[PDB]
Amino acid sequence: SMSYTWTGALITPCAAEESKLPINALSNSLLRHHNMVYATTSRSAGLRQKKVTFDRLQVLDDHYRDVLKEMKAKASTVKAKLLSVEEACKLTPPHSAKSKFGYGAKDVRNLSSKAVNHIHSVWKDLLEDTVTPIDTTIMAKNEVFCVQRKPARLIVFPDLGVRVCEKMALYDVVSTLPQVVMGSSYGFQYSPGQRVEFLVNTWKSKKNPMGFSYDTRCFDSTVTENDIRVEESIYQCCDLAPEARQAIKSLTERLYIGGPLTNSKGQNCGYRRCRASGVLTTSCGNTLTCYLKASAACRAAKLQDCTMLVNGDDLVVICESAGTQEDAASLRVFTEAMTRYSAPPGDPPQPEYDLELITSCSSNVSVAHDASGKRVYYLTRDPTTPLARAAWETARHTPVNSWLGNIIMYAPTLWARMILMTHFFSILLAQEQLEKALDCQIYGACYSIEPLDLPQIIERLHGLSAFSLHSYSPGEINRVASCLRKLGVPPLRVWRHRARSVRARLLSQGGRAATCGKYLFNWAVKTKLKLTPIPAASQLDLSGWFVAGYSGGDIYH
Numbered sequence: 001s002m003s004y005t006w007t008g009a010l011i012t013p014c015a016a017e018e019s020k021l022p023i024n025a026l027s028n029s030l031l032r033h034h035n036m037v038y039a040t041t042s043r044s045a046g047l048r049q050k051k052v053t054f055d056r057l058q059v060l061d062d063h064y065r066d067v068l069k070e071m072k073a074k075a076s077t078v079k080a081k082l083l084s085v086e087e088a089c090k091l092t093p094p095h096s097a098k099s100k101f102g103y104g105a106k107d108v109r110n111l112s113s114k115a116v117n118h119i120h121s122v123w124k125d126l127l128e129d130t131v132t133p134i135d136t137t138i139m140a141k142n143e144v145f146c147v148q149r150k151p152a153r154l155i156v157f158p159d160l161g162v163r164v165c166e167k168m169a170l171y172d173v174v175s176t177l178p179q180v181v182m183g184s185s186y187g188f189q190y191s192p193g194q195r196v197e198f199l200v201n202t203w204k205s206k207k208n209p210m211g212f213s214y215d216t217r218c219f220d221s222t223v224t225e226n227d228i229r230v231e232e233s234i235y236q237c238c239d240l241a242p243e244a245r246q247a248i249k250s251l252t253e254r255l256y257i258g259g260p261l262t263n264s265k266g267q268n269c270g271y272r273r274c275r276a277s278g279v280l281t282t283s284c285g286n287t288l289t290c291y292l293k294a295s296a297a298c299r300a301a302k303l304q305d306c307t308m309l310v311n312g313d314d315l316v317v318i319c320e321s322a323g324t325q326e327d328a329a330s331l332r333v334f335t336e337a338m339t340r341y342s343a344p345p346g347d348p349p350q351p352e353y354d355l356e357l358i359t360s361c362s363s364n365v366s367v368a369h370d371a372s373g374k375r376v377y378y379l380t381r382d383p384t385t386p387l388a389r390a391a392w393e394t395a396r397h398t399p400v401n402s403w404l405g406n407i408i409m410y411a412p413t414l415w416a417r418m419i420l421m422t423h424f425f426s427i428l429l430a431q432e433q434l435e436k437a438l439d440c441q442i443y444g445a446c447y448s449i450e451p452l453d454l455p456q457i458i459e460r461l462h463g464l465s466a467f468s469l470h471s472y473s474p475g476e477i478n479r480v481a482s483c484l485r486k487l488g489v490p491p492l493r494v495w496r497h498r499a500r501s502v503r504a505r506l507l508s509q510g511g512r513a514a515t516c517g518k519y520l521f522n523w524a525v526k527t528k529l530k531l532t533p534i535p536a537a538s539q540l541d542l543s544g545w546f547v548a549g550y551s552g553g554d555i556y557h
């Protein structure tokens with residue numbers, strides 16, 4: 001069937017949408033070439049609608065069913081609990097979209113009777129009705145990029161009340177099932193250090209290692225009614241309260257399989273018959289469906305000793321090489337299989353023989369040396385987008401601070417240390433907002449983070465070596481430098497000079513601030529200070545951090 005049907009009605013915004021990078025006093029110190037940076041708006045949605053709207057054909061063979069059977073066998077070992085209204089409300093982001101029924105995110109959060117009562121009736125209606133499609137809102141995301149222009153991505157989501165109900169029935173399942181089903185292949189269990197560790201070990205466990213990433217063209221669109229039914233049958237294998245079983249089935253038929261699409265003004269835009277991007281099961285459903293399809297496609301393509309790493313729709317395979325010709329013909333069969341299962345590629349997959357040339361989760365492996373000169377691997381990426389978005393966040397307050405997300409996830413990198421840390425700590429010092437808790441996203445989940453805990457966070461996710469890393473690869477250095485020339489970002493010798501200031505200013509303040517200066521900026525000085533384990537680092541509660549993915553799942557820890 002068709003992924004989408006359109007009435008002709010326009011996808012509308014809520015407020016005004018800026019496409020031009022906003023400029024303030026701090027902007028120029030980070031980025032000169034302001035015309036290179038832009039944010040997508042709802043005005044480019046018409047182009048996105050064309051792209052993601054196609055007919056899907058699915059041809060399921062024996063490999064497909066075998067893998068599914070294996071997945072169900074493990075899923076049936078899981079016991080998941082029904083969450084209470086209260087517990088589910090505590091999981092709602094403070095900046096989450098208001099309900100059409102008179103209450104908002106903060107009303108839900110502090111458990112007002114108006115919020116709690118409507119959630120109960122939405123739940124009750126879920127138990128009684130397993131057929132009536134549920135209203136969803138379609139919006140256009142505002143994402144910032146650098147020109148190379150991309151049309152906006154679409155977000156489809158049900159009303160707040162339903163989102164809380166999703167959490168009640170499905171929060172435990174989506175948090176626990178994927179690891180049990182997919183084992184070490186499930187990538188959202190991994191912190192950066194563990195992921196690097198796992199990619200490298202996997203690369204080393206192969207006599208002649210070959211690797212490739214598989215980019216599906218618009219994954220959400222390729223997902224069929226079948227895939228959503230299949231993913232529900234997986235959920236139903238769990239030991240579940242009879243109320244959870246009813247709700248899950250109901251949400252599958254009424255929400256996850258499809259439904260009408262309503263713009264922010266209240267007009268009907270059309271109908272969806274594919275994956276909604278703003279439901280709780282978006283991440284887990286895509287991960288299960290991607291894993292199922294790929295594993296089966298490995299059997300069809302007869303890939304020798306393949307280890308898979310899956311994060312939602314992001315997929316990387318590492319296996320034994322049969323030589324460049326056989327690898328090329330293997331990947332075609334893989335691609336044909338995936339295409340038959342309704343997961344065609346965007347770019348054709350290419351086999352890589354160097355681990356560092358492989359991109360997965362927008363990240364590639366690279367190597368540096370620590371204080372002992374001892375080789376250490378870390379994940380990095382092209383810094384073009386993270387810097388473009390930092391530039392935007394230098395001039396505009398945002399609900400999600402991507403700069404912090406990038407520092408947390410890319411702390412060991414050259415560009416996050418010298419540019420991102422230096423720039424933003426400079427900003428926080430001038431405002432005296434070091435103690436101020438900030439919101440960011442890790443694996444789709446929203447986190448309130450105090451910047452002064454960054455040293456303790458980095459020690460736990462990357463290890464101490466992250467504060468010492470030096471002698472970066474020529475290839476990494478070339479990419480970082482090429483980005484700054486393109487963007488008009490000051491050279492890295494200017495950033496070092498600025499870092500000396502930021503460090504001293506932090507040290508002069510003592511307490512947790514001096515701790516930040518000591519660890520985060522030890523690189524900037526020739527006369528190096530010794531970096532021992534942090535006194536109160538093991539105090540921070542880092543549970544929930546790397547259990548599951550929750551992209552568009554409206555989650556807050």
Ligand SMILES: CC[C@H]1CC(O)=C(C2=Nc3ccc(NS(C)(=O)=O)cc3S(=O)(=O)N2)C(=O)N1Cc1ccc(F)cc1
Binds near residue numbers: 313
């Ligand atoms: C700053 C971004 C950083 C952290 C991060 O949240 C992600 C991420 N990766 C994803 C990858 C794929 C999806 N696809 S989806 C929509 O769930 O089907 C969703 C996410 S996500 O929304 O859950 N977030 C991500 O890919 N990265 C890069 C990364 C990943 C692992 C790592 F160890 C280091 C950096």
